[PDB]
Design a protein around this ligand. Sequence first.
Ligand SMILES: NC(=O)c1cc([N+](=O)[O-])c(NCCO)cc1NCc1cnc(N)nc1
Length: 294
Amino acid sequence: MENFQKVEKIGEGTYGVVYKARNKLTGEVVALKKIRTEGVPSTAIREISLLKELNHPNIVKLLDVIHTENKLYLVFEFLHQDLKKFMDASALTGIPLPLIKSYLFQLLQGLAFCHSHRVLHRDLKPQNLLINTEGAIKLADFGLARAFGVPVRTYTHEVVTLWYRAPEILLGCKYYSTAVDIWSLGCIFAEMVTRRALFPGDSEIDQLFRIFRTLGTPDEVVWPGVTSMPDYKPSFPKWARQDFSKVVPPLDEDGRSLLSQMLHYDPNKRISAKAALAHPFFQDVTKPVPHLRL
Ligand SMILES: NC(=O)c1cc([N+](=O)[O-])c(NCCO)cc1NCc1cnc(N)nc1
């Protein structure tokens, strides 16, 4: 790197290597992503550059976008931990409900902001949610999916996780709506509460069938138009829906009600981030500080 001293490798991103680095000139510490191939589309450049204006306290700030020598670098605000690691570290005891509620509330604010500006994330997962010692949580990588493309396998051949993918995406819908993000967040909310992934599919069909086994195989009554979707097959097994009381115990009725609305099959019925913020579940929301050992 030029003006960046590499501090540590944070990981093997979905697009490329990510390093914690220090700007030799400003001394600021940032996350530096090196994106993959042989030219880099300009549309992606214009689109990514636009995200530099998408600023919100619950959105990881994109500081700069640099395209050079067939490489694309993205410079982001640095946070010390991600929610996946935090959940693993809180597995034995569980994240306290007040903190789960604070995190969900902040994430919904972030989604409401992005959605109002017509920006979708499309690939939300615990590892893309970053946290600090002050109790804040932020969405990382908003808008990248639209500017780059389909995942499938990271640059290191790692497998793309399908656990948080909305059913309309799995059924081949070509146009994504803001509802795909609400679905992913509902899945994450459930996982924070139960300490186990809600739908851990290991293939696209396993992912879809895990969803059907819990929420029931969708039909025209609950999801008008589902039988006409690209990948829908009349041969899909017909599973009965299960009760949320069994899905995310021992979450209370306000929590189960909100989760049920974030997981409605019909993208048009699925609650918006804005409406979710007004749900009674958040009546007593607060902002606790997590126990973070860095
Ligand atoms: N912007 C960032 O600070 C950041 C960026 C990415 N990323 O660009 O992928 C990331 N990857 C998720 C984990 O692979 C994690 C981040 N922060 C939390 C963190 C986690 N683990 C270490 N070791 N250090 C920091």
